[PDB]
Design a protein that fits this description.
The complex is a heterodimer of chains A (about 325) and B (about 425).
Chain A lengths: L12 E4 L3 H13 L7 E5 L6 E7 L2 E8 L2 H7 L5 E4 L3 H11 L7 E4 L6 H14 L2 E3 L6 E3 L3 E2 L7 H6 L8 E5 L2 H14 L3 E6 L10 H9 L6 E7 L6 H8 L7 E6 L26 H11 L10 H14 L4
Helix pairs in contact in A: 8-9
Chain B lengths: L1 E4 L1 H11 L13 E3 L5 H7 L8 E5 L13 E4 L1 H8 L6 E4 L2 E4 L3 E5 L8 E9 L2 E7 L2 E5 L7 H7 L9 H17 L2 E12 L2 E4 L3 E5 L3 H8 L14 H12 L3 E6 L6 E3 L1 E2 L1 H13 L8 E6 L4 H14 L9 E5 L9 H14 L1 H6 L2 E6 L5 H15 L3 E4 L7 H6 L13
Parallel strand pairs in B: 15-18, 16-17, 18-19, 19-20
Antiparallel strand pairs in B: 1-13, 2-7, 3-4, 3-7, 5-6, 8-9, 8-11, 9-10, 11-12, 11-13, 14-17
The chains are: A alpha/beta (about 325), B alpha+beta (about 425).
The structure holds adenosine-5'-diphosphate (ADP), adenosine and magnesium ion.
Adenosine-5'-diphosphate binds next to strand 3, strand 7 and strand 11 of chain B.
PDB class: transferase
Keywords: TEV cleaved, ATP-grasp fold, Tartrate binding, transferase
Assembly: dimeric
């Protein structure tokens, strides 16, 4: 895909939108991760003039600048290489295209649900040409423990602490579901040394970045010793994992479960909550994906109920042989 | 998401909005029939039904109607009425779905030869839109690429009869511009017929990207998205859909079996599917009433309006074994669990009478912001109302409450509120 590494404990972001709770939540995580500086350098919000917003770094009140114009924010913050876009669905396309006119921006998270597929394909084309990683649309984002978290991902401090998301473990994951990625945070933290990095690619038909884009990053990241994928009915993205193993590109252990196995038992097609979560042919079903992953050498549980158990088993074998 | 439209809707849009030099025949010549049709009034509005023979077929998203005996070809009006007698308003099973044949299209029969039938299809993928032609040729049209008639002649029409390349190319170029302008994701014409008199769109199947309504509504109008064959549409679904449209919060509801004893009201796209998966992995697929989810930090009032719809729908008729309500979720990232569960609790209170009558038992599992107060007010309403409610937090595996509710595993009181 594109870059192997998207975030570090020095990452600085611009947030597009008046999302003070999301930004404070990022700063709370930054503090317990022992970052030197807040991860949000500035916000862009065209419905107000330039001003400063009060936030808290631990107990200390600090100011983060809010800009009417993206051009001012970019120029005053050349250190920023990430933009988190909370624009509504109506303007997410234009503001994301605008962001990609700034060469400093290498990663964009697009939060909004409901962006037309045809507009997302054009974002994907511009992004692929510029080497920009898009996470989303229709996502909460992702989290790199110790380093950086997107927006609301991982929730409040009490959850960050409970799931040990303040320092990295050895397990990376990728999921379609935002809510379920916080469940993976929980599961992984209870069965392993914890999350190294997690990404929610969102539920749309054409995610800005696919499972394989991130699995390849994790394969190429030395701190990552094993990989968890939570797939979903719809599309064929997961078969790229079978291919990567077959080619010898993916060598680290991979655990995967695809959700949506109930669709196979309904007498008619059911569109689930995520826009892309609908099978258009037999191979797009969760049951077919899970069976192909299993035959290719992925560790597949019998059902979501056994996911934690297989993750723990793979983790323990890797400790036994000195990999972790 | 991409949603199917009826053949009638798609042809109406195509006849209104396609731009082609090709002479398209029979524009707007279709008539819709249902078990409630006033046939005298129909013939007042569509006198052409007497002018030539006809074709009749259901327009309910049924594929391969010809192979199922569901296209009546070359009939007089009287022949159409006779063909409809054993079908119109009858139950039919197609594949594994069962529903009523209740919506039919009548169109002019178009005499033509096999060599005058063509296949054209356009469909969307990540890398662009593929255009298919068969008299099989297929061309990827990239995201920023145009499709001009000369392109179609060069890449698709190599095998087409020489006298038809110009009209085929003009039509397909027009079709593709129409597909893009109206945000289609799938458009199939099988067959397209071209005779000495022009172009005939004999069949049409299509999907549009329903999220593009804010862009397309001037051209789409009051477009309808029919349910798949084998399901009904319900007013509660339309009510939730209306809520979903008014806010950035996601509120979905799809009724599977209105008489099933197993109801869910789960937060989140992913978790709602995993709960459904787990219910069916455990035998309850014939008793699962609904699929849906709420997510995206809905307000207490949105969550009340959502929940009261569910509680109404599961107190319509009694069940010998009572009913189960699964109020579930992952550990939310940002949804105010207290605020949303207060909405649900208020719904439960308003419906506590009916809920007791239908012997509803409630299981709750949820984490996220403010969830401890969320779990408390659930436990509280249970004691106030007399409804049995069993309340679990992050210390319970997300789907454990499904096994609890179907009796596969016991209820662990040692984990209540944790
Ligand atoms: N208006 C028509 N005039 C003449 N023949 C028709 C007409 N409509 C359909 N047919 C014939 O009937 C066949 C089946 O009808 P169609 O609408 O294509 O349904 P399906 O593809 O679902 O079987 C067509 O492929 C064509 O051969
Ligand atoms: N031929 C007809 N038979 C029965 N109802 C009709 C007919 N024509 C129009 N209607 C109905 O009248 C309404 C528009 O006035 C629509 O709901 C339509 O279904
Ligand atoms: Mg056909």
């Amino acid at each position: 895909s594109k870059s192997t590494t998207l975030f570090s404990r020095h990452t600085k972001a611009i947030v597009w939108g008046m999302q003070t709770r999301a930004v404070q939540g990022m700063l709370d995580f930054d503090y317990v991760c022992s970052r030197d500086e807040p991860s949000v350098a500035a916000m862009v919000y065209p419905f107000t003039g330039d001003h400063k917003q009060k936030f808290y770094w631990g107990h200390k009140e600090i100011l983060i600048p809010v800009f009417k114009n993206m051009a001012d924010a970019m120029r005053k913050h050349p250190e920023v290489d990430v933009l988190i876009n909370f624009a509504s669905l109506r303007s997410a396309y234009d503001s994301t295209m605008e962001t990609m006119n700034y060469a400093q921006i290498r990663t964009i998270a697009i939060i909004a649900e409901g962006i037309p597929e045809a507009l997302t394909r054009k974002l994907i084309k511009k992004a692929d040409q510029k080497g920009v990683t898009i996470i989303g649309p229709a996502t909460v984002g992702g989290i790199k423990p110790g380093c950086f978290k997107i927006g609301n991902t991982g929730g409040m401090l009490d959850n960050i602490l409970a799931s040990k998301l303040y320092r990295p473990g050895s397990v990376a994951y990728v999921s379609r579901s935002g809510g379920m990625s916080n469940e993976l945070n929980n599961i992984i933290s209870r069965t392993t040394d914890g999350v190294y990095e997690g990404v929610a690619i969102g539920g749309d038909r054409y995610p800005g970045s696919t499972f394989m884009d991130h699995v390849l990053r994790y394969q190429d990241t030395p701190g990552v010793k094993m990989i968890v994928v939570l797939g979903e009915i719809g599309g064929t993205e997961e078969y790229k994992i079978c291919r990567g193993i077959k080619e010898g590109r993916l060598t680290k252990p991979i655990v995967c479960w695809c959700i949506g196995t109930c669709a196979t038992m309904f007498s008619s097609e059911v569109q689930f909550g995520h826009a892309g979560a609908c099978a258009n042919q037999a191979s797009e079903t969760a049951v077919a994906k899970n069976q192909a992953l299993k035959e290719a050498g992925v560790f597949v549980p019998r059902s979501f109920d056994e996911l934690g158990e297989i993750i723990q088993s793979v983790y323990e074998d890797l400790v036994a042989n000195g990999v972790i | 998401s991409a949603k199917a439209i009826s053949e009638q809707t798609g042809k109406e849009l195509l006849y209104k909005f396609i731009c082609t030099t090709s002479a398209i025949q029979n524009r707007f010549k279709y008539a819709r029939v249902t078990p409630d049709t006033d046939w005298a009034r129909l013939l007042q509005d569509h006198p052409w039904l007497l002018s030539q023979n006809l074709v009749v077929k259901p327009d309910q998203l049924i594929k391969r109607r010809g192979k199922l005996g569901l296209v009546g070809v070359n009939l007089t009006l009287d022949g159409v009425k006779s063909w409809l007698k054993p079908r119109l308003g009858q139950e039919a099973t197609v594949g594994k779905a069962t529903g009523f044949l209740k919506n039919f299209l009548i169109e002019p029969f178009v005499p033509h030869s096999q060599a005058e039938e063509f296949y054209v299809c356009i469909y969307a993928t990540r890398e662009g839109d593929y255009v298919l032609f068969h008299h099989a040729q297929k061309l990827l049209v990239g995201v920023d690429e145009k499709l001009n008639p000369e392109d179609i002649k060069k890449h698709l029409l190599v095998h087409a009869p020489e006298d038809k390349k110009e009209i085929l190319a003009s039509f397909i170029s027009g079709l593709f511009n129409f597909y893009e302008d109206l945000y289609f994701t799938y458009l199939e014409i099988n067959p397209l017929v071209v005779t000495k008199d022009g172009v005939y769109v004999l069949d049409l199947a299509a999907k549009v990207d329903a999220t593009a309504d804010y862009i397309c509504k001037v051209k789409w109008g009051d477009i309808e998205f029919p349910p798949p064959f084998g399901r009904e549409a319900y007013p509660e679904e339309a009510y939730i859909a209306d809520l979903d449209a008014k806010s950035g919060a996601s509120l979905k509801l799809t009724l599977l079996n209105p008489k099933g004893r197993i109801w869910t009201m789960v937060a989140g796209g992913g978790a709602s599917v995993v709960y459904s998966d787990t219910i069916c992995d455990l035998g309850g697929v014939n008793e699962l009433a609904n699929y849906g989810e709420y997510s995206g930090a809905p307000s207490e009032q949105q969550t009340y309006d959502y929940a009261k719809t569910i509680l109404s729908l599961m107190t319509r008729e009694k069940h010998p074994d009572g009913k189960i309500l699964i109020i579930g979720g992952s550990i939310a990232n940002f949804t105010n669990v207290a605020a949303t569960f207060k909405g649900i609790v208020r719904a439960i209170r308003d419906y506590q009478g009916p809920l007791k009558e239908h012997e509803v038992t409630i299981f709750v599992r949820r984490g996220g912001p403010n969830y401890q107060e969320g779990l408390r007010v659930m436990g509280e309403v249970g004691k106030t109302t007399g409804i049995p409610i069993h309340v679990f937090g992050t210390e319970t595996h997300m789907t454990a409450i499904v096994g609890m509710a179907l009796g596969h595993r016991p209820i662990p009181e040692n984990l209540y509120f944790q």
